[PDB]
From a paper:
The overall fold of this enzyme places it into the well-characterized short-chain dehydrogenase/reductase (SDR) superfamily of enzymes. Unique to this protein is an extended α-helix that precedes the beginning of the Rossmann fold that is found in all SDR proteins. The individual subunits adopt a bilobal-type architecture with the N-terminal domain composed of Met 1 to Thr 201 and the C-terminal domain formed by Ala 202 to Glu 332.
The asymmetric unit also contained a dimer, and the α-carbons for the two subunits superimpose with a root-mean-square deviation of 0.4 Å. Whereas the enzyme was crystallized in the presence of CDP-6-d-glucitol and NADP(H), no electron density was observed for the dinucleotide. The electron density was unambiguous for the CDP-6-d-glucitol ligands in both subunits, however, as can be seen in Figure 8a for the ligand bound to Subunit B. The α-carbons for Subunit B with either bound CDP or CDP-6-d-glucitol correspond with a root-mean-square deviation of 0.5 Å. The C2′ hydroxyl hydrogen bonds with the backbone carbonyl oxygen of Thr 195. The C3′ and C4′ hydroxyls are bridged by Nε2 of Gln 196, and the C5′ hydroxyl hydrogen bonds to the side chain of Glu 140. Although the NADP(H) ligand was not bound, it is possible to approximate the position of the dinucleotide by superimposing the two structures presented here. This superposition suggests that the C2′ carbon of the substrate is within 3 Å of C4 of the nicotinamide ring of the cofactor and lies on the si face.
Residue numbers in the entry:
A (entry chain A): 1 to 334
B (entry chain B): -7 to 334
Write the structure that this text describes.
């Protein structure tokens, strides 16, 4: 646990400590600081910068932060955006609902939360004279655009009658706002679009596919696929997402959109079940007669990631170490 | 005054309301006595709807400024006693039966000069009217939407299942994106809380009671003719769309109000009025005896790129609706009405 994390932290600081210290003593606010990516950014940066962490619930941000070996006292945790009086130089907006079920069960809320939080955070930044804001977005913004070498100018098309579009539509409008604040008020903004993050400190209560697999293998000595498992995507280790964001934080550029993916990790859902079954000594069963309306249709997509590689970033964590480090940290917690 | 003992309401508006009763009073009447909230009731379309329905029906209006709603509703010779204006939803106490959500920005310049407010006004207004329609236990909500939602989808015969795609770095997409996210919320509310909703996508309304401050191209062409003895085209004017009389928009909406259907989308267009911007400019130049000139040197960033497009309007027609007002009557009545104001 301390093993896994400490290694990585030293790996990051070995390879990139140059860049990480272009934000020494920068005043940095992270929204959703309690979530998967939020935490690890907080973890990586709080020694080397003043960190403000905006979260839904301070107490569990405290539990979570010292589970991942953090220094409670080197971060200021707010629950209310308007109590943050200090001047922020960099905002990293990471807050959003993450579960597939919530997107189809509460599509209105999904939109309202994401839309309102984006609006508020943009107000805040422009009023607080922020130097840069980074907005986490999603590969789901590409919609019907399938296949390889998808570039940040490709544009998805979205039906207003498909409930599950709650999530992309919400991130789409947020992006549009983000770019519009940049062009109206010459405020530097970046949008970063993730595939799906994996790796240590993922929680067993997550229902995104990687953890549905790990958790089914452990708790039911079985992994069940509700589809044929032909969806093919790239994955990335959460620390590789953090580092990518850091490289983007250091860039002077009034506006840019960056895909974030590890292109070496391209694999199908089925192939992902198999690897995880092998690592956890379990078998893979199908069951294709359940309701799957929270899920996306079958597709394949690779993201052109030329921009983050041009900044000098590289991914440190292949699929194996990411899975192993993820699995190990779930065992070691329960 | 009333020297011929026939009342004093505007002649153009009188005639239009009478054709409207003769042709479609069956449906207009089916809405009688029904409690009806109209948002943006001060605007071009909401006000004509209010004027049409506030005879027979009890009618609640929602507006930014009750002031200019009173002034609007009497420019168009409404009866202020028979409507109940409000600036805030949380007042409205009585059981609303039907909601017609018409409020929205309307001006191209505002979409590029205020893209964030364009989004935020439409989103918030939509969300609010939806919360309210769920609280109050409304029969049906009708959301007014735009052909701009078709975005890049161009050409003839565009259906309601088609949809556009929008770049997040084109500022001018404020409007369509706001309407898209709103359409989506309207559908999501229907599917999730069995709230009967209808979406009506409009081309561009014209006809009498168009106010002279409006900068959409029809009035750009009319206020230009009159205030400067000249009609100026800032593009080659090849854009080709369908237009519709504002009264014809209103009847279309009333027809949809009489439908009992959980969720439906309707394109609202008069396909008999399919004209280029250039030909629109010509016909308006002929009726005011002014000339048409090109100025291609201005910033046109608030304007959509040049396209040609027809909406498929079969569904509205299959209900029994027809447009009563061809291009000639709509322009003529629209010019005459502006002249009586100044
Ligand atoms: N028990 C299973 C589980 C899964 N599958 C298959 O895996 C696919 C992928 O599963 P999911 O990723 O969990 O669900 P989804 O399709 O909704 O995509 C969500 C994804 O875009 C987001 O999670 C973002 O990556 C994230 O960054 C947001 O914060 C499913 O669509 C289904 O085909 C399955 O067959 N049997
Ligand atoms: N002085 C002129 C004026 C115009 N034109 C041309 O006419 C086109 C049409 O002008 P506009 O309609 O005013 O501008 P826009 O393209 O922004 O379309 C707005 C329209 O989609 C909405 O107004 C909806 O119809 C309405 O329902 C929203 O409430 C311009 O894009 C331009 O090519 C011109 O050449 N010279
Ligand atoms: Cl959080
Ligand atoms: Cl704005
Ligand atoms: Na139709």
């Amino acid at each position: 646990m301390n093993e896994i994390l400490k290694k990585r932290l030293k790996l990051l600081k070995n390879n990139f400590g140059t860049h990480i210290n272009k934000i020494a003593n920068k005043k940095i606010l992270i929204t959703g600081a309690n979530g998967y990516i939020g935490s690890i950014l907080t973890l990586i940066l709080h020694g080397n910068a003043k960190l403000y962490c905006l979260v839904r619930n301070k107490d569990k941000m405290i539990d979570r932060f010292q589970e991942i070996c953090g220094d409670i006292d080197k971060i200021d945790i707010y629950e209310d955006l308007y109590k943050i009086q200090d001047k922020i130089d960099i905002v990293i907006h990471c807050a959003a609902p993450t579960q597939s079920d919530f997107f189809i069960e509460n599509p209105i809320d999904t939109v309202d939360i994401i839309y309102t939080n984006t609006k508020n955070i943009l107000d805040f930044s422009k009023k607080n004279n922020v130097e840069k804001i980074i907005f986490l977005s999603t590969m789901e913004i590409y919609g019907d655009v399938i296949g390889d070498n998808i570039v940040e100018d490709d544009i998805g098309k979205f039906s207003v009658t498909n409930i599950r579009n709650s999530y992309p539509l919400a991130k789409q409008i947020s992006e549009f706002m983000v770019h519009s604040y940049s062009k109206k008020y010459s405020l530097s903004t970046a949008i970063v679009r993730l595939t799906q993050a994996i790796g240590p400190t993922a929680q067993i209560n997550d229902n995104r596919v990687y953890m549905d697999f790990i958790r089914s293998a452990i708790k039911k000595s079985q992994i069940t696929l509700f589809t044929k498992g032909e969806t093919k995507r790239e994955y990335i280790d959460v620390f590789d997402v953090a580092t990518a964001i850091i490289f983007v934080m250091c860039e002077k550029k009034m506006f840019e959109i960056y895909n974030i993916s590890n292109p070496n990790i391209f694999i199908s859902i089925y192939d992902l079940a198999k690897t995880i079954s092998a690592k956890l000594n379990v078998q893979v069963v199908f069951d294709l007669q359940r309701d799957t309306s929270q899920y996306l249709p079958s597709f394949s997509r690779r993201l052109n990631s030329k921009k983050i590689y041009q900044l000098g970033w590289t991914p440190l964590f292949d699929l194996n170490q990411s899975l192993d480090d993820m699995i190990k940290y779930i065992k070691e917690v329960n």
